[PDB]
Design an enzyme around this catalytic site. Structure first.
Site, mmCIF file in Angstrom:
data_model
loop_
_atom_site.group_PDB
_atom_site.id
_atom_site.type_symbol
_atom_site.label_atom_id
_atom_site.label_comp_id
_atom_site.label_asym_id
_atom_site.label_seq_id
_atom_site.Cartn_x
_atom_site.Cartn_y
_atom_site.Cartn_z
ATOM 1 N N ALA D 248 19.411 9.878 12.211
ATOM 2 C CA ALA D 248 18.594 10.925 11.632
ATOM 3 C C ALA D 248 17.819 10.421 10.419
ATOM 4 O O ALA D 248 16.581 10.394 10.409
ATOM 5 C CB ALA D 248 19.464 12.110 11.244
ATOM 6 N N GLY D 296 9.608 8.788 12.448
ATOM 7 C CA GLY D 296 9.254 10.183 12.299
ATOM 8 C C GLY D 296 10.427 10.921 11.700
ATOM 9 O O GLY D 296 11.573 10.631 12.004
ATOM 10 N N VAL D 297 10.149 11.902 10.865
ATOM 11 C CA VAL D 297 11.167 12.810 10.388
ATOM 12 C C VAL D 297 10.522 14.158 10.216
ATOM 13 O O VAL D 297 9.551 14.267 9.464
ATOM 14 C CB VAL D 297 11.763 12.398 9.032
ATOM 15 C CG1 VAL D 297 12.780 13.446 8.574
ATOM 16 C CG2 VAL D 297 12.394 11.029 9.086
ATOM 17 N N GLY D 298 11.066 15.182 10.853
ATOM 18 C CA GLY D 298 10.568 16.524 10.642
ATOM 19 C C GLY D 298 9.063 16.602 10.692
ATOM 20 O O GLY D 298 8.461 17.079 9.736
ATOM 21 N N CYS D 303 9.347 23.039 12.892
ATOM 22 C CA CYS D 303 10.466 22.455 13.645
ATOM 23 C C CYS D 303 11.788 22.693 12.894
ATOM 24 O O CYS D 303 11.784 22.994 11.692
ATOM 25 C CB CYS D 303 10.238 20.962 13.906
ATOM 26 S SG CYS D 303 10.635 19.804 12.536
#
Lengths: 454, 458, 458, 456
Positions: D248, D296-298, D303
């Site tokens: 994550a 990518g994050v959020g 989302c």
């Protein structure tokens, strides 16, 4: 101060929809390593405060929240008797053990059926001479006639352990139990309260909020009308751990006088002042002797305050500004912008607020004051009621202006799992081990409206 | 001038959705401490002007609004005879006491039931030889046949007080009464008019707008086609307290000529000119002799004007600019950008507009000219009608939008215009307490604004 | 150059939703005082060009538009014989008098009823030995059997005047007439064509677009594949007034070569080139010999081109930049971005385009090539059809979008393309009166624009 | 660096909805002249990597994609036996010839009708002792009882050609065939696999992705929990062509240790690291020994990650920043923001990403692990399942957020159809910027910023 990405300098103020948190380098292993404790003197172990709305804050609410580390503010202009009764009630309860619904065998089923939804336990305890004789479920009240005594339908088969038993153990004992409720007994066998599988795990995680004496913390509110010095006096002596002065427009003469009135009494309690969105207002309120400033006015563009008056401020910018002005004066900020999502709480904290006040979001739970109803589609929702010269009442009223319940998770303890889970993840992303570090290490950026298109 | 937060300096013009008012320090206790009077020479005690639209402004509109302090502009190209009759009518009414619907026993029930919704009283007064014999409700006309005489269904039980009675008492007398209407009687016992429990409190709050002779104010409008001087002369001499020269595009030679024509006659009346969104147009109109400049053109991005021509301006910026230009020339600005919410009225005033012209919003009321109908869902709405040389009209009609008459929904709870004015003035009053202003000039001097993005509407 | 309000200098390119036109001082009395004529060598008296799409441009289209001042481009890769037949068809019709649907008595009802909607007249002319014997309406085809001969249902009562008769008289003669069609007769009594009440006023307003010989103008298109010079020659000698070289990406080596190929032949015709959004492409295309540059690529944010490739430009900024590059090199620009509103044409002209190409918007009309069908709700719509080794055909079709033919909804009130032209020119005419221009050159020179935010669309 | 139009300097970060690509001068004839090959050492001839999601990546997936030039990353914490069986399975298949659903005459119809939608061919091959006896269609399973033996309904009429036959010829033979399937036979007459009319054209276009031994490429993933060195070694020795470390929050201490652990083993394979949106994080991962950085994050505003934590970054701006930091250190960047449109892939590449990872978009396809069901409207959709300490399951799960399903496009239901849609768009992008290949796309591209007003 809060960092923004190089180049991000808007010609406008920011809402929670305008900003995003950029993840930094993080030494934080898991969410459990994060300390959500607040330094504002509220004594809360989680950055959550429940609003002084009548619909949200009842006896049951104040109890349940404090146990899990939050605190609840009792509504202003509430009868002083009722107040003191509630304080003593809550301050007297068990830290690790909840308070179940109690039923005497003489009570009817309609009483039993309506009382079951007043707590999240999903079962009622039938009590005889202060000892448990068995439990009642919704399954039991199903086919039984409304006026039949509950003695007929009671299920006397349940699980029991003495109060003070190690929670880790209590979960294992409840594993194969048909009912998720464990009845806790005093040394003499009288009813202490109950505990559930999850409710047990909570004790392992959430640190309760207590006062000097080790009693669950609770707070209360007062208007600026009438005698302010008097009410604050009465409320303080009734055992309130914190005070809140609340009004629509917090920056005004009557408010400043009111804070002075309460500050002079020197009750030695954290004092919170009404609502302002500006640094000027934040200084003016602290200077009048408020320890903490609560901030929001017309935060949403389409909200009723804004559509009526055109007055308000985007919440992120408002909290950022007011919190910074407060730190200079050695004080703290509460975010009173209505929060419907965990990120609202995370951002409010990143912007520098010490605590976040949550509104009618929590009205959608078992623990709120209203009765639980069902619509034509049989979906649950809670409903409550917002109740001196006859001619003047009509004259003043001339200009004067329920919430759905989640069937899956209907208890407020669940909403807090949702909130604290998100806020804990926010901290792990920025690399902070706690709320003070969050404000320090946080890096933000601005996004446009284009991301919301479909 | 109006202040904006430090750093807010957009590359675009601003609509009412782009801005917000920031609360400052305020010594103002409550809304009742705020003075809503306007200094523009219109004489209104609230910042509300009703538009010269045919659907909204009638006799009943002019009467009702002026009593609570606004003013109504009568439609242009209205028959000069018809004007004078409306003028004499409104100027003749009572300041504290309204005008109920009148009924002779000879009239039918279908007439009485259609007349009942023309006022917010909820009751009609049955009159005999100029004296009240009783009242009529919708409950009375329910089951009775359409062609029955109203003498049969009349309820002779009602409340009465002499005209000039102190309103506070009149509210008390109506306290437990089953009907909210109290019939006010002249010295000779003839019908003066009525008053309601809520209608009584209004007189306590709203200051009526009156002329020199103490008669309720009323205004009228005139086009730029034909003889403007003659029309203006006639309307003025017909008793109009204010004049409005109105056209779609206010900045053009024909408008400037029209204004001079009215200005040269020196009728000594406040003069308002046609519509403009720019500082240049505001000065040009004031130089032509206009006292007041009305501002909006294509205010909405999706409105018919904007989607047709690509022309318009965002209303906040237009008002700000044009209002600042007027002050230099010692004159004022009316905001004609359409208002659907109180905050629209609040922001216009904060932007420096002296008065705000209110549009089809008021067409959804009992007091507007149209008849009250009901749709398939039995929801109330009002409907009116917008009704020329030798087939040359067809040549002109080719490019004309050719829009047939339209109707507006009515709020069932509060259906009277006086209810909407409670809604409007409440917000404006809260805006002032929020900025710390005790009145409209102070709102404009002390107000601080800020800009928000579009993301907040997501 | 285009002027923007002081301070409006966005960090982004603009769409038509991003800008607004600020009204200036205007000496222009009415819309009729505006000259919509174009200077680009197209010869259109209105700034409208109909797209070279197969759904839109047929014989009837070319005739109806050119009469009202526009010009229609015929689809590329159309058989040259069929082209010549259409050209001669159009160049042969009457300037003031339309062409009615013709019927022989031997024809069936199903043919007659299906032929009626192919024109906006609402009536078909029954012809015997080149003379009108009567008319057919939709009311006539109601109850009659599908296969009955039309001789049975014909109504022989109608109005007639000689060809060349003054249009004003024709309206008066048609004034009380039950049918809106007047049959125009040649000197020998043969059928010249028809005219309607509204169709008459158009001649009074719209100036027809004609060539040196006084024939209605028409244009054609050609792709960049195969021999370009050859195809162009054929088209030029077939009577084409204007040529269009068209492709998805106008800025590429293959497009430059095609233009050199047509320019080298010196056919003396206005030459239009495919599509680009950049100044660089506009130079390269003109330098290669293009007279006029057509501009749009991915105008819409959510359109198929944009969503597939991520490529395109916001149309307002594209037209402004490209028109600027075109003028410096002594040329003109066509706005090819899809237009659904009158303001799209107006904002396009304001940005500096000499002409605006209208696409599938016009497919929803009577005069478009398709057959008129009706859906489950009986709402009208037009439908058309878009109809080398199979292994390669399968190979090319693999990456191809493979979109089957489409249909467009028809406005029931005004369904003829001439009505869409009334709508459009009306808006473009008003835009000019607001800015103070007597014509399109003056429009581009005297216009003032501003930028608005997205918040106004909430 | 990447060019933006003069004057475009936003005070905010950009998503894909914020930007547009401006066409430049182009010498490129047609889409077919464009080379989509990647230089990042992935060995993909198209810029597409299938995500390591359990719902998306199966045996059938790894096979189908690698053939058309992409590569599929196998889920972490997948049983090491199942991995090697899957790897050995995929690396063993044919380059030009697919693998049909096989049926024994003994299998039931309820098995055959359920087995038919696991591949996009529209027919199943009935096999006897390793030889084709005929085919089964959906039309054959219509009226037959669910439990009747399939020997009864079999259609023995089909088309056959030798393995190694030129695909164009195979297309002509299938021209008038009532079934679009041609059974390809080995030299001994046993079943090699099948080929369809469209599947033939694919071989002419898509170049397969292979390793040194000429075997179809495949990749696998590993978490940061437990022994990272141990899992990576086994996976490498299981025949994995590329490795991916996934988490994550990619910028953290635990990740840096995990990368160092795998880098020290020097397995000589391309190494991908978890997810970060910042240039700092991009360097820290490369410096730890990562060859390629996934970003990518959020990415979306609405989302769940963003609505939960408030954390994330607009994807365009993120990729641009990260790829710039990677190019300087001589490394590459993968775009991990979820892609629902070809324009997402094209713009990601324009931003400097060498490869684009595609998510649950591909779960709505025949070749994905799930079973194909049908709703009340009889519309197709795919559904799969995301299935130690007894006390911790309750404790850890308290803060944790079930398996999800995706709808299927009836017109185009196979992933190869999605690849046609995707590569068609990306190809046009290159012809629009005038680039003959992905390196030229990043070099020659010009971008601009648009406002939100265009979406009204």
């Amino acid at each position: 101060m809060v960092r923004f990405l190089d180049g991000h300098t808007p010609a406008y103020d920011l809402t929670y929809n305008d900003v995003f948190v950029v993840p930094g380098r993080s030494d934080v292993a898991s969410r459990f390593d994060v300390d959500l404790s607040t330094v504002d003197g509220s004594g809360t172990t989680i950055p959550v405060v429940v609003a002084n709305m009548t619909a949200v804050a009842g006896r049951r609410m104040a109890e349940t929240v404090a146990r899990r580390g939050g605190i609840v503010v009792l509504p202003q202009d509430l009868p002083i008797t009722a107040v003191s009764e509630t304080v003593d009630f809550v301050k007297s309860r068990d830290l690790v053990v909840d308070t179940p619904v109690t039923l005497s065998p003489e009570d009817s089923v309609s009483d039993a059926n309506a009382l079951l939804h007043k707590r999240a336990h999903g079962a009622a305890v039938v009590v005889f001479e202060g000892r448990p004789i068995g439990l009642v479920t919704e399954a039991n009240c199903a086919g039984v006639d409304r006026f039949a005594r509950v003695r007929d339908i009671a299920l006397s088969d349940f699980v029991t352990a003495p109060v003070g038993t190690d929670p880790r153990e209590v979960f294992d004992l409840l594993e194969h139990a048909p009912i998720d409720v464990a009845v806790m007994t005093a040394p003499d066998g009288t009813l202490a309260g109950v505990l559930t599988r999850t409710g047990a795990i909570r004790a392992g995680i959430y640190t309760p909020a207590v006062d000097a004496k080790g009693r669950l913390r609770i707070a209360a509110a007062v208007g600026i009308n009438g005698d302010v010095g008097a009410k604050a006096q009465a409320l303080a002596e009734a055992g309130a751990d914190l005070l809140v002065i609340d009004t629509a427009h917090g920056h005004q003469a009557k408010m400043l006088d009111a804070i002075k009135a309460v500050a002079s009494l020197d009750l030695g309690l954290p004092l919170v002042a009404g609502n302002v969105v500006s640094a000027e207002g934040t200084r003016d309120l602290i200077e009048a002797g408020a320890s903490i400033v609560k901030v929001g006015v017309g935060p949403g563009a389409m909200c009723t305050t804004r559509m009526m008056t055109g007055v308000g401020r985007p919440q992120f910018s408002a909290v950022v500004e007011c919190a910074a002005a407060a730190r200079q004066l050695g004080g703290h900020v509460w975010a009173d912008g209505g929060v419907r999502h965990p990120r609202d709480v995370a951002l409010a904290l990143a912007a520098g607020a010490s605590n976040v006040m949550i509104g009618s979001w929590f009205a959608g739970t078992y623990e709120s004051p209203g009765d639980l109803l069902f619509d034509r589609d049989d979906r649950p929702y809670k409903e409550s009621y917002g109740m001196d010269s006859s001619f003047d009442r009509a004259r003043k009223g001339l200009f004067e202006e329920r919430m759905s319940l989640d069937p899956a998770r209907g208890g407020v303890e669940d909403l807090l799992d949702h909130i604290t889970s998100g806020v804990r993840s926010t901290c792990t992303y920025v690399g902070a081990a706690n709320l003070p570090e969050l404000h320090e290490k946080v890096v933000l950026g601005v996004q446009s409206a284009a991301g919301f298109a479909e």
